[PDB]
Chains A and B, each alone.
Chain A
Amino acid sequence: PDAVFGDRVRRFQEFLDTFTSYRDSVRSIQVYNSNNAANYNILPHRIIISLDDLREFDRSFWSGILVEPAYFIPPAEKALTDLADSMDDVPHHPWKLSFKGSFGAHALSPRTLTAQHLNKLVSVEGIVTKTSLVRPKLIRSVHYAAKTGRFHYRDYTDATTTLTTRIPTPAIYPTEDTEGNKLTTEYGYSTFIDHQRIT
């Protein structure tokens, strides 16, 4: 990724003034999570970028978020994760976005469909009446060889990365890697996430 990264790189130096007002907010919410939990004797990773502060002094970086929003979100994640440890790492989950603001005539009532802004941003209102189940789902397990005492590491992608068209991995537990070790996996060191379908 050389040429598809420079405008991603140029954004990484650009929007640091857009969170001049949020670089306090990203760290202040987690220092008490490092203080409630360390002194028990709790919040998710939500970073509300206003659309105004990005619109106020950027155009090409702004126009792509309402035309082709398929190359541009894991940019803003990638700057955001390295500005969490570089803020706070000494005490020993990718901080995805929320993206609130205004939109300028994208209040598509779903009686109407789009013919032009397929695969774009869209604001939708209404009432829900379905409320289906809740069920966990992996993203990544951590294999382990008991003989020679060394771990392994594998990610399994699905239709939840939202933007990249990944080659699917329809495997449940790939066992017996290229060795003679009966594989183990520390599921407490694994990681999980859930889904909920609602109409």
Chain B
Amino acid sequence: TELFPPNLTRRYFLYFKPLSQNCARRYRISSKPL
């Protein structure tokens, strides 16, 4: 008896998306084009 490791039944991934719009000029960088 061994349970499934969590990476087995995924069939999906995750992604991310930063910001450099006027929302950053609203108030308080992470997305300055260095």
- B3: chain A residues at CB < 8 Å are none
- Residue total for A at the interface (Cβ-Cβ under 8 A): 2
- A41: chain B residues at CB < 8 Å are 25, 27-28
In the complex, the 5 A-B pairs of residues with the closest C-beta atoms, listed nearest first: A41-B28, A40-B29, A41-B25, A40-B28, A41-B27
The A-contacting residues of B in range 1-34, CB under 8 angstroms, are: 25, 27-29
Residue of B nearest to A38 (CB): B28
Q: How far is the CB of B1 from chain A (nearest CB, A)?
A: 19
Per DSSP, chain B at the interface is loop
The docked-state distance in angstroms from the alpha carbon of A41 to that of B25 is: 7
Q: How far is the CB of B3 from chain A (nearest CB, A)?
A: 15
- B28: chain A residues at CB < 8 Å are 40-41
Q: How far is the CB of B25 from chain A (nearest CB, A)?
A: 7
- A40: chain B residues at CB < 8 Å are 28-29
Residue of B nearest to A39 (CB): B28
Give me 5 A-to-B residue pairs in the complex whose CB atoms sit less than 8 angstroms apart, sorted by A's number: A40-B28, A40-B29, A41-B25, A41-B27, A41-B28
The B-contacting residues of A in range 34-65, CB under 8 angstroms, are: 40-41
- B25: chain A residues at CB < 8 Å are 41
Q: How far is the CB of B22 from chain A (nearest CB, A)?
A: 11
The docked-state distance in angstroms from the alpha carbon of A14 to that of B13 is: 61
The docked-state distance in angstroms from the alpha carbon of A41 to that of B28 is: 8
The docked-state distance in angstroms from the alpha carbon of A40 to that of B27 is: 11
- B29: chain A residues at CB < 8 Å are 40
The docked-state distance in angstroms from the alpha carbon of A41 to that of B29 is: 9
Residue of A nearest to B25 (CB): A41
The docked-state distance in angstroms from the alpha carbon of A44 to that of B25 is: 28
Q: How far is the CB of A134 from chain B (nearest CB, A)?
A: 15
Residue of B nearest to A40 (CB): B29
